[PDB]
Write a protein that binds this ligand. Structure first.
Ligand SMILES: OC[C@H]1O[C@@H](O[C@H]2[C@H](O)[C@@H](O)[C@H](O[C@H]3[C@H](O)[C@@H](O)[C@H](O)O[C@@H]3CO)O[C@@H]2CO)[C@H](O)[C@@H](O)[C@@H]1O
Length: 406
């Protein structure tokens, strides 16, 4: 049988085994094709995927972050153009924007799953502090008042930090700013995706509101020294009253109960992100699938991609990974009425905004990770007291950098 090689980022608790279980129905019905997944850690994924494209030494297939798809597809001769080979009618239409290069009709990836970041909260902490999550998290300033009530209260054998978020360089630095900028009434780029615009008055108001939560003590300043993975573990250990995180954490916290007796999962809830003056907006992310032009099994690889778009494969990978499907028929399944999953679905469906699918965005995120993290260094007073004016200068500088890339 053809052994399709496939790179995946760590999308679930046991990524390789989980992937293999989801594709077992495919090999059952296609005995000539097996799948060998290889895990590629997120911090190395852009360099490794890019090196695979430029060198010609590549697997048959790789997962690609939705925001990077245009960058890899724009590399001449790197990927197989999928335009016309995939029935787009089956997909949630909003998920297709990242499969194309913006400004063209060229599709170089197939949507695989979507995700957004929602507001997890500890029910016991909110009940003690008199915080009512559905309404007290509904707006910027109601959220802020809620953090004031939650900060420092004693739950279990610890003093809880009201909000815990990472500040260290990783791909989520910009993602965690995104919906504060959108909700303030700003954006990262103009409609054409050719000019950076997040130094606008409204964009800065969202950057100022969010970053100054830590200056005011409502967001845990020491936690800014950590990355997303460390924040997710800390919240799983009960360190924070609230945190903005993706749905995948539900897998880890559920296993923590099954394996360690940590019942955190049973005393947490999730609400949509608070609404800003622009209305509610949320980060829309996810990953697509691509076929390398160097593959010697392009026919078999396309069959596997089509399987991953099937209703049952979309549901089963959602159940194990907690990512949201991109195929409309998958939402006929009652699984997405789950109390936690339904929140992510409603939020990304109604309010999810994705970045412009331009070839330069991958290089833009490299700069964002380094540039916007300097705002957190300003908050942490690494070099001098905090000042908003220094944040404005960082944002102006980062914007200039992005403008050179575009
Ligand atoms: O910006 C590049 C892409 O990022 C995607 O978000 C991913 C984050 O970059 C990544 O840090 C995070 O990693 C999770 C992992 O999914 C999970 O299995 C593990 O348990 O915890 C990690 C965090 O500590 O995963 C997300 C989602 O894959 C965007 O979705 C994508 O649009 C974007 O191109």
């Amino acid at each position: 049988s053809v052994k399709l090689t496939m790179w995946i980022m760590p999308n679930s608790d046991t990524p390789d085994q989980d992937l293999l279980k989801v594709v077992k129905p495919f090999t059952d019905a296609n005995p000539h094709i097996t799948v060998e997944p290889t895990v590629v850690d997120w911090s190395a994924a852009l360099t490794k995927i890019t090196a695979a494209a430029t060198s010609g030494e590549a697997p048959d297939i790789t997962q690609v972050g939705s925001t990077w798809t245009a960058a890899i597809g724009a590399m001449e001769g790197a990927l197989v153009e999928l335009t016309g080979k995939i029935d787009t009618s089956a997909f949630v239409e909003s998920t297709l924007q990242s499969a194309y290069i913006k400004g063209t009709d060229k599709m170089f990836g197939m949507p695989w799953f979507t995700e957004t970041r929602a507001l997890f909260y500890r029910k016991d902490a909110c009940e003690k502090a008199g915080v009512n999550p559905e309404t007290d998290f509904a707006t910027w300033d109601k959220f802020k008042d809620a953090l004031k009530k939650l900060n420092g209260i004693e739950v279990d054998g610890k003093k809880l930090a009201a909000l815990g978020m990472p500040g260290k360089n990783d791909w989520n630095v910009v993602h965690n700013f995104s919906w504060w900028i959108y909700g303030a009434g700003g954006d990262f780029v103009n409609e054409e995706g050719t000019q950076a615009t997040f130094s606008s008055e409204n964009a800065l108001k969202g950057i100022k509101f969010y970053s100054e939560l830590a200056v005011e003590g409502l967001m845990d300043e020491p936690s800014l020294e950590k990355n997303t993975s460390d924040i997710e573990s800390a919240f799983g250990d009960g360190a924070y009253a609230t945190a903005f995180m993706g749905p995948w954490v539900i897998s880890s916290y559920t296993k923590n109960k099954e394996e360690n007796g940590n019942d955190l999962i049973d005393k947490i809830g999730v609400t949509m992100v608070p609404e800003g003056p622009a209305g509610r907006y949320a980060f829309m992310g996810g990953s697509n699938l691509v076929i390398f032009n160097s593959s010697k099994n392009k026919d078999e690889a396309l069959e596997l991609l089509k399987f991953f778009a099937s209703k049952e494969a979309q549901v089963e990978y959602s159940k194990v990974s907690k990512m949201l499907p991109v195929v409309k028929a998958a939402y006929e399944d009652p699984y997405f009425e789950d109390s936690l999953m339904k929140v992510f679905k409603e939020q990304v469906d109604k309010y999810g905004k994705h970045y412009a699918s331009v070839p330069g965005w991958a290089s833009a995120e490299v700069i964002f990770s380094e540039g916007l993290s300097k705002i957190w260094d300003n908050v942490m007073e690494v070099d001098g007291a905090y000042s908003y004016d220094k944040t404005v200068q960082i944002v102006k500088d980062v914007e200039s950098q992005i403008n050179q890339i575009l």
